[PDB]
Amino acid sequence: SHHHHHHSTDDLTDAELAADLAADAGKLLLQVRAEIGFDQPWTLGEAGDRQANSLLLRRLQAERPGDAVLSEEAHDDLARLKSDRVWIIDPLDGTREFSTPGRDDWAVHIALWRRSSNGQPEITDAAVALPARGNVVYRTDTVTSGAAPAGVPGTLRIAVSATRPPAVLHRIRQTLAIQPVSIGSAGAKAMAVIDGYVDAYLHAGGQWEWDSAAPAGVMLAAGMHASRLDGSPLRYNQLDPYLPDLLMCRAEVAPILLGAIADAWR
Ligand code: NA
């Protein structure tokens, strides 16, 4: 729709652009999936990440030529460290899931980091697409707050995905009734929290910035919780863009889980 340039496609707000980029990459990923098919999963996953990255860098160049870009799929020249505006993107989160027939738990992550003196809310705008799920795009400018708790009281559903369960989860399951819910891709795990399909998404051991920046942005915009496991803020555009761990969860469950994590270390 035709509109006036936002106060303070061409002429999108940053959140609009994040959403449009996520949707466009999502469509391309769906095209690649259809074209290549599933008989060679390695090749499928590689073609998808490579082509989605090309689309995203091309369009960020065109529509935001002054902004820096940290992409999972591109070399990192560290110019971003000097920038006040940095896109943190994963063109394809969940290559295994993308390359498996029938699975829809893979995502595209598009996040804008903006330099903040005080307030520290670094990811200002973001979108997560789940292309196989009707190409739904979750966006910081439309997600809503106040979601009503869905599960049986006294039991937590927690999205996790790992080649092996972390020790901290073993410990907190001694004290809290938890059902681990196996979902692929960081993006799908996080959006399950937004959806109310699970109560929390927990990750121990490292994760790259591009797989949590967009989910975290959307989570905070929805009034939910996103932090390190020790409760300190997630930091982005770091020299080493790697987060040792994280918790995203609905607001009501944050104190219980942060508490259990802290008590684990006793
Ligand atoms: Na990727």
UniProtKB/Swiss-Prot annotation:
Substrate binds at residues 72, 92-95, 211. It comes from Mycobacterium tuberculosis (strain CDC 1551 / Oshkosh). Pathway: Sulfur metabolism; sulfate assimilation. It catalyses: adenosine 3',5'-bisphosphate + H2O = AMP + phosphate; beta-D-fructose 1,6-bisphosphate + H2O = beta-D-fructose 6-phosphate + phosphate; a myo-inositol phosphate + H2O = myo-inositol + phosphate. GO terms for molecular function: 3'(2'),5'-bisphosphate nucleotidase activity; fructose 1,6-bisphosphate 1-phosphatase activity; inositol monophosphate phosphatase activity; metal ion binding. Phosphatase with a broad specificity. Its primary physiological function is to dephosphorylate 3'-phosphoadenosine 5'-phosphate (PAP) and 3'-phosphoadenosine 5'-phosphosulfate (PAPS). Thus, plays a role in mycobacterial sulfur metabolism, since it can serve as a key regulator of the sulfate assimilation pathway by controlling the pools of PAP and PAPS in the cell. To a lesser extent, is also able to hydrolyze inositol 1-phosphate (I-1-P), fructose 1,6-bisphosphate (FBP) (to fructose 6-phosphate (F-6-P)) and AMP in vitro, but this might not be significant in vivo. Pfam families: Inositol_P. GO terms for biological process: 3'-phosphoadenosine 5'-phosphosulfate metabolic process; sulfate assimilation. Keywords: Hydrolase, Magnesium, Metal-binding. This is 3'-phosphoadenosine 5'-phosphate phosphatase. The gene is cysQ.
